Design a binder for this molecule. Structure first.
Ligand SMILES: Nc1nc2c(c(=O)[nH]1)N[C@H]1C(S)=C(S)[C@@H](COP(=O)(O)OP(=O)(O)OC[C@H]3O[C@@H](n4cnc5c(=O)[nH]c(N)nc54)[C@H](O)[C@@H]3O)O[C@H]1N2
Ligand SMILES: Nc1nc2c(c(=O)[nH]1)N[C@H]1C(S)=C(S)[C@@H](COP(=O)(O)OP(=O)(O)OC[C@H]3O[C@@H](n4cnc5c(=O)[nH]c(N)nc54)[C@H](O)[C@@H]3O)O[C@H]1N2
Ligand code: SF4
Ligand code: SF4
Ligand code: SF4
Ligand code: SF4
Ligand code: SF4
Ligand code: SF4
Ligand code: SF4
Ligand code: SF4
Ligand code: SF4
Ligand SMILES: [Mo]
Lengths: 131, 79, 438, 296, 321
């Protein structure tokens, strides 16, 4: 439930950004939770279903999958990007490096809700979402 | 003389299948190199096996054991 | 069909220069790219695109975005930089070292805050270097001598793809003719990453406890390791002793670190306990820490501003004749939090995407300028988007590898007719500012 | 990336849209590009329309073929009945001259000619071919194992039969479709009389629903006895029969099976990581939730 | 056609079972893939040329799943059982109906290998070295387990025959033997036995040479597949001790090499290894077939790169003059 969390890289993610930050490849690569199978069962998350990742510094609806890179029971992971930084807390501990890995978060299975694109996320956080 | 198959869809271009193959390592790393042909070369980001006719592999498994995200399947049965 | 050798891949810290391009007959289409990883392949495939930005583009009142001339964009930026009270220029991860010198000059004229991706990435590491030092080495040294390799909190397989096949593990060096088979690879991180798949050991540590892990290792090294508890950080004492014995017997070791240490609790204290461990191991062996720098020339801003102002990052250029540096006070994220800025200039990075969204919200209150070759999040929430050449594809120059070794990148494509590069652009901005007489 | 015109008949777009969505996505993930067909209609459904008038069957199938002819592309299909109509009319009109002539002077009233220049493929046939995406490429693309699930295959009749008119080989006990399900990681099981018709062909589904449902119920009994957890199929007719007909069997008879029926493209999407919501598994009469619990 | 000669080849777990059905009579050549070592002394010896050798290194390392070390064409095999008699580490068995049955030995038509094992129980001292150094699991030591690692076999004080003082002579509690169908004659246990109480004689005699200057480094396949662990990677010297001699890349211990041939079959190099056997040691008299088999086993061989494609899926070595 407290479900500690980290935010890291993946080659598909790098590939995606160099295809383009506004591309379907980037959407598919970054909008991803890679959590543990035991945690998915205990929470009640169907594999490949949207889920509400809500930390103290935001919220994001992100697809929930299982990752080869075996997260031990009690860990989460989003490939870094728009979606992860919608929920990363900004605390720096007077070093300038925000808490990019190791912040608590609660996970709520919420299917039937769409995913927010990168443009929609950022331009709506700022207030520029024309479309 | 076996057959190796590389799953292009998850190959990242890491080049650790090229560096680790002991038939590739024959040219530059042997005294009086015998044969200078190479099984793999990473062209356009994925490992391409130049050994089309399956003449140089020796089923060593150094390349299957090397790829970080398993993507090389080694076939020990006649193609 | 004009094969070009010795090109540079401009993405990860590896700064790989063993790239071969087969440019088209007319010298403006890239056909096949050999010897590079996929992330790189895509960089070149994007650089050789036919439909790419060519002119700046301004935000009109309606909210759309229309083009303007380079001189008009330079005039806009110069006037705003002079009118502001503490502008902030951020980025420089992906630029040549002349791009990071021209920027230093521009903000010397202006008087704002000059900063790079070091703050949010490996700046906690520099802060430890300031505390303890940086016992390091070039990458050919680990290629030719390394007997033990430790990837503490890093993931080369997905961060730096051809790091293992070029510098650390698989190459058969001079004193390591046997190749991988005499290298002991230890990977520490809570996940079972692809680097751990390739590795021979794995110390699956609780996320955040690396300080306790380092302290355990160092008590073992200092000799009375019997005083360890039963388990430390989730790692078991016998495994700790196993890895420590291997480290002691190493003929020449090398430790690599990354976000596992620079982005968790005790940002810089993790790194400096690591450096202390390295300095302690050099009592009985030879060990060299080394930081997994991310972008190609992200060590370029460090050296260039080291020779110019003496400070690698978080530069307080507001006194106009003496600079200051204190990461907790002068860094981009802290200033964005405490709304201490007046203008944000996006140069060689993607602040909108890769900053926390509270910081982006705080920053967008002011004008926002982006100098990028292509569309990204910053160029989508900016006020004007000035195009610029891509390092290593449209323009060459010096870049700085992971280990501060300068690679010389080459040019393979001429940039689209009209597009200039950042050193020409920043120089024109500085000339116009001096024309405005400030 | 091979490119094919995507015929997309009536039932997949209008009753099971997840089938077509997964078709496009999974085909793109493997090296296939499925292009929309511009103004295609019902392939004159071979039973319900061929039983009425063979000449208008020929004319409508030929119109569907000449759309893709003008597109200059090869048809790709996901339905065995649509395969029958399109592929078989293409084959007949490539060889029978008086039928070419008749169809051409019917089509000349709408400024449109048939010349016989393209080929028709079933998507599963393409997935099985080695030149185009093969079984190994499917295995490569699979990212969720779908292990520990017993899955029964229904081949249908119009894809493989008659073997004197097709090129898929043995009709008595084919195993090719079982290899595609084995590629996904699910173990395909064998049941009694696996090559039996589902009962919906030829318009029997409409003419005599009880007769058609008895034919379907024979299959459902055999499949349950084998122990299947889902029924893969390569035909939206057969999927509609096995899906609606379970409900009609539950009401007209007293038999309960609750066996999910999924198109192979839907299973391929599940294997490649598509979401159940993105596959629209809520549009099936029979709940897929037990199967999803097993394979997820 | 006709059906009843039903030829089948099933991989039942770790055993590859090759079968020939009749109504009531079967024939089961069973290969235990956990014991095969990738030598070709089963392919060289096959009178009917059916056994071929596969991906030795990959299979012996666990990286290959759809194959064994050897492929037997069970349509060509004749179920003589010569392969079962002439395999140094018994990883091939013949079962006629349901029982391990060798008709050619029952009629004495073929000699067998004289591994000649023995452990003079009046000299062995229940030491633990011979079980520890044995490359294969072939030392069956039957000893009561004292307080070391377990509850007392008799007692720490009854491990020595003491009158409770002085010891009465000798203790020797238990009995140690060598499973004669598993020993490969490596001699790790005879060379390292403390009391010289083990008598094993190598089945093959000859010489094997390693041209270290032709090993391409990171290829310890030979080391991984050697059954008798004769091969080693010579340990790199420390600094201030290298003395201008850098290091060798590979070498062998002729004391422990049993002249099997797995190293040659596994090396992907060109001619790093030279193998030549000179004399096999047998009991049982001889046969014209056995003279042919001697001639086949005694031809020198070495690795090869770029063998012919028509035989892709198997190994072909170089014939040395
Ligand atoms: N494809 C792609 N490649 C990239 C990037 C990208 O975005 N995409 N980014 C580039 C840049 S900007 C960066 S700085 C580099 C950096 O990349 P790296 O420095 O190599 O770090 P990461 O790739 O994020 O993975 C860090 C590993 O540390 C683990 N970890 C997390 N928390 C802890 C902890 O508390 N303790 C320990 N011991 N480990 C922990 C994480 O699980 C992860 O396995 O990569 C560069 N390469
Ligand atoms: N959730 C989460 N977020 C993170 C992190 C994390 O760990 N977790 N890590 C943070 C860290 S480590 C950093 S590095 C950031 C990294 O993130 P960034 O530093 O922003 O890296 P990119 O987004 O790839 O920036 C590349 C942009 O520069 C352009 N470019 C390329 N060459 C040039 C050039 O020569 N001149 C100019 N003017 N532009 C060029 C490129 O087209 C592209 O627009 O991610 C940060 N955000
Ligand atoms: S099995 Fe060995 S010889 Fe064959 S390709 Fe792999 S590394 Fe090279
Ligand atoms: S090692 Fe694996 S991922 Fe790397 S190039 Fe070879 S096949 Fe691709
Ligand atoms: S490792 Fe980095 S620098 Fe080297 S080719 Fe890959 S992306 Fe380019
Ligand atoms: S002779 Fe060698 S390869 Fe043949 S079965 Fe015996 S151990 Fe295996
Ligand atoms: S039983 Fe005889 S014929 Fe059959 S494989 Fe063995 S040696 Fe060859
Ligand atoms: S090594 Fe010799 S003395 Fe020791 S147990 Fe074995 S046979 Fe007996
Ligand atoms: S000769 Fe070798 S295999 Fe045989 S018992 Fe002695 S150590 Fe074991
Ligand atoms: S060293 Fe001797 S026992 Fe080992 S593989 Fe080579 S020939 Fe066989
Ligand atoms: S002898 Fe053969 S197996 Fe051993 S290192 Fe050389 S090539 Fe590799
Ligand atoms: Mo970074």
């Amino acid at each position: 439930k407290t479900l500690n969390m980290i935010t890291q890289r993946a080659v598909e993610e790098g590939i995606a950004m160099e295809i383009g930050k506004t591309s379907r490849q980037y959407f598919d690569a970054c909008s991803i939770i890679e959590m543990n199978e035991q945690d998915m069962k205990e929470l009640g998350i169907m594999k490949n279903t949207n889920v509400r990742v809500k930390s103290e510094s935001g919220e994001v609806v992100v697809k929930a999958v299982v990752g080869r890179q075996t997260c031990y029971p009690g860990l989460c992971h989003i490939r870094q990007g728009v979606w992860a930084n919608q929920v990363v807390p900004p605390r720096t501990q007077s070093t300038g490096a925000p808490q990019y890995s190791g912040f608590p978060v609660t996970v709520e299975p919420v299917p039937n809700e769409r995913l927010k694109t990168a443009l929609e996320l950022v331009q709506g956080a700022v207030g520029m979402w024309k479309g | 003389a076996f057959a190796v198959h590389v799953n292009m869809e998850r190959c990242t271009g890491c080049n650790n299948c090229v560096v680790a193959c002991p038939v590739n390592a024959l040219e530059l790393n042997t005294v009086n190199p015998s044969s200078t042909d190479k099984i793999y070369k990473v062209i356009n980001g994925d490992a391409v096996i130049l050994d089309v006719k399956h003449e140089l592999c020796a089923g060593c498994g150094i390349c299957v054991d090397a790829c970080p995200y398993d993507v090389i399947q080694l076939s020990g049965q006649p193609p | 069909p004009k094969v070009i050798e010795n090109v540079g891949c401009p993405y990860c810290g590896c700064s790989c220069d063993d790239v071969r391009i087969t440019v088209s007959d007319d010298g403006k289409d890239i056909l096949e790219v050999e010897n590079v990883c996929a992330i790189g392949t895509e960089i070149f495939k994007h650089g050789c695109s036919k439909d790419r930005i060519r002119l700046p583009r301004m935000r009109q009142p309606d909210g759309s975005m229309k083009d303007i001339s380079y001189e008009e964009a330079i005039d806009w930026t110069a006037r705003h930089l002079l009118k502001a009270k503490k502008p902030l220029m951020y980025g420089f991860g992906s630029t040549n070292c002349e791009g990071q010198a021209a920027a230093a000059r521009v903000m010397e004229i202006a008087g704002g805050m000059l900063d790079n991706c070091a703050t949010i990435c490996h700046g906690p590491s520099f802060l430890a270097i300031f505390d303890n030092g940086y016992p390091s080495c070039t990458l050919g040294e680990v290629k030719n001598r390394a007997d033990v390799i430790v990837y503490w909190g890093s993931n080369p397989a997905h961060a730096h793809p051809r790091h293992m096949s070029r510098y650390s593990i698989f190459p058969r060096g001079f004193f390591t003719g046997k190749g991988q088979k005499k290298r002991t690879v230890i990977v520490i991180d809570p996940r079972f990453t692809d680097t751990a798949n390739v590795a021979d050991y794995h110390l699956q540590v609780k996320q955040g406890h690396d300080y306790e892990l380092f302290n355990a290792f160092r008590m073992v090294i200092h000799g009375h390791g019997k005083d360890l508890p039963d388990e430390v950080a989730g790692i078991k004492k016998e495994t700790i002793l196993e890895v420590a014995e291997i480290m002691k017997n190493a003929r020449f070791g090398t430790t690599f670190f990354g976000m596992g240490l620079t982005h968790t609790d005790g940002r810089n204290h993790n790194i400096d306990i690591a450096i202390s461990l390295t300095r302690d191991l050099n009592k009985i062996s030879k060990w060299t820490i080394m930081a997994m720098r991310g972008h190609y020339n992200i060590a370029g801003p460090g050296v260039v501003w080291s020779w110019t102002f003496g400070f690698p990052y978080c530069l307080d250029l507001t006194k106009q004749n003496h600079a200051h540096m204190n990461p907790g006070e002068t860094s981009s994220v802290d200033m964005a939090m405490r709304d201490e800025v007046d203008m944000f200039i996006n140069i060689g990075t993607d602040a909108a995407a890769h900053f926390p969204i509270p910081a982006v919200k705080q920053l967008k209150k002011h004008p926002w300028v982006t100098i990028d070759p292509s569309i990204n999040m910053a160029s989508e929430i900016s006020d004007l988007h000035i195009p610029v050449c891509i390092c290593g594809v449209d323009v060459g120059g010096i870049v700085y590898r992971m280990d501060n070794v300068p690679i010389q990148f080459r040019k393979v494509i001429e940039p689209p007719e009209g597009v200039m590069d950042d050193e020409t652009l920043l120089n024109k901005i500085a000339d116009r500012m001096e024309e405005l007489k400030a | 990336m091979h490119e094919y015109a995507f015929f997309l008949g009536c039932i997949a777009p209008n009753r099971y849209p997840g089938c077509e969505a997964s078709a496009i996505k999974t085909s793109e993930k493997v090296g296939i590009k499925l292009l929309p067909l511009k103004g295609a209609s019902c392939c004159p459904a071979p039973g319900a329309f061929g039983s009425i008038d063979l000449n208008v069957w020929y004319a409508m199938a030929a119109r569907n073929l000449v759309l893709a002819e003008e597109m200059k592309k090869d048809i790709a299909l996901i339905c065995n009945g649509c395969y029958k109509s399109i592929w078989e009319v293409n084959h007949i009109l490539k060889h029978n001259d008086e039928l070419r002539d008749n169809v051409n002077e019917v089509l000349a009233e709408i400024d449109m000619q048939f010349k016989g220049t393209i080929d028709v493929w079933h998507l599963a046939e393409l997935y099985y071919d080695d030149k185009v995406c093969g079984v190994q490429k499917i295995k490569d693309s699979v990212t969720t194992p779908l292990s520990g699930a017993k899955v029964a295959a229904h081949y249908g009749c119009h894809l493989m039969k008659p073997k004197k008119e097709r090129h898929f080989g043995d009709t008595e006990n084919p195993m090719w479709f079982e290899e595609l399900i084995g590629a996904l990681g699910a173990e395909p099981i064998q049941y009694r009389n696996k090559m039996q018709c589902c009962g919906a062909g030829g318009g029997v589904r409409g003419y005599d629903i009880v007769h058609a449902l008895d034919i379907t119920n024979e299959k459902l009994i055999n499949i349950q006895e084998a122990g299947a957890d889902a029924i893969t199929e390569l035909c939206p007719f057969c999927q509609l029969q096995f899906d609606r007909g379970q409900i009609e069997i539950k009401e007209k008879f007293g038999d309960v099976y609750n066996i999910p029926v999924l198109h192979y493209n839907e299973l391929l999407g599940l294997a490649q990581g598509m979401s159940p919501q993105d596959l629209a598994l809520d549009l099936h009469a029979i709940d897929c939730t037990p199967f999803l619990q097993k394979v997820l | 056609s006709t059906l009843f000669p039903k030829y089948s080849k099933t991989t039942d777990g770790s055993k590859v079972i090759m079968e020939q059905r009749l109504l009531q009579q079967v024939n089961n050549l069973i290969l235990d893939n956990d014991i095969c070592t990738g030598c070709g002394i089963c392919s060289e010896v096959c009178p009917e040329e059916a056994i071929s050798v596969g991906a030795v290194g990959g299979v012996r390392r666990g990286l290959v799943d759809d194959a064994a070390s050897i492929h037997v064409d069970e349509t060509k095999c004749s179920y003589c059982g010569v392969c079962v008699i002439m395999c140094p580490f018994s990883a091939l068995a013949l079962k006629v109906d349901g029982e391990e049955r060798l008709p050619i030995l029952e009629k004495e038509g073929f000699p067998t290998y004289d591994k000649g094992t023995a452990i003079d129980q009046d000299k062995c001292v229940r030491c633990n070295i011979c079980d520890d150094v044995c490359p294969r699991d072939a030392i069956d030591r039957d000893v009561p387990l004292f307080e070391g690692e377990d509850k007392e076999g008799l007692a720490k004080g009854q491990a020595v025959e003491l009158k409770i003082r002085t010891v009465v002579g000798q203790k020797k509690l238990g009995n140690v033997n060598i499973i004669d169908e598993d020993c490969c004659t490596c001699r790790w246990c005879a060379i390292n036995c403390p009391t010289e109480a083990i008598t094993v004689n190598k089945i093959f005699e000859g010489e094997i040479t390693f041209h270290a200057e032709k090993c391409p480094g990171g290829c310890s396949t030979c080391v991984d597949v050697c059954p008798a662990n004769a091969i080693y990677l010579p340990t790199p010297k420390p600094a201030k001790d290298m003395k201008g001699q850098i290091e060798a890349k590979i070498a062998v211990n002729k004391d422990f090499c049993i002249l099997c041939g797995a190293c040659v079959n596994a090396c992907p190099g060109e001619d790093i290894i030279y193998l030549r056997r000179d004399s096999v040691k047998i009991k049982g008299k001889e046969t014209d077939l056995f003279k042919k088999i001697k001639e086949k086993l005694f031809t020198p061989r070495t690795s090869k790169v770029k063998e012919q494609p028509s035989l892709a899926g198997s190994v072909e070595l170089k014939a040395v003059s």
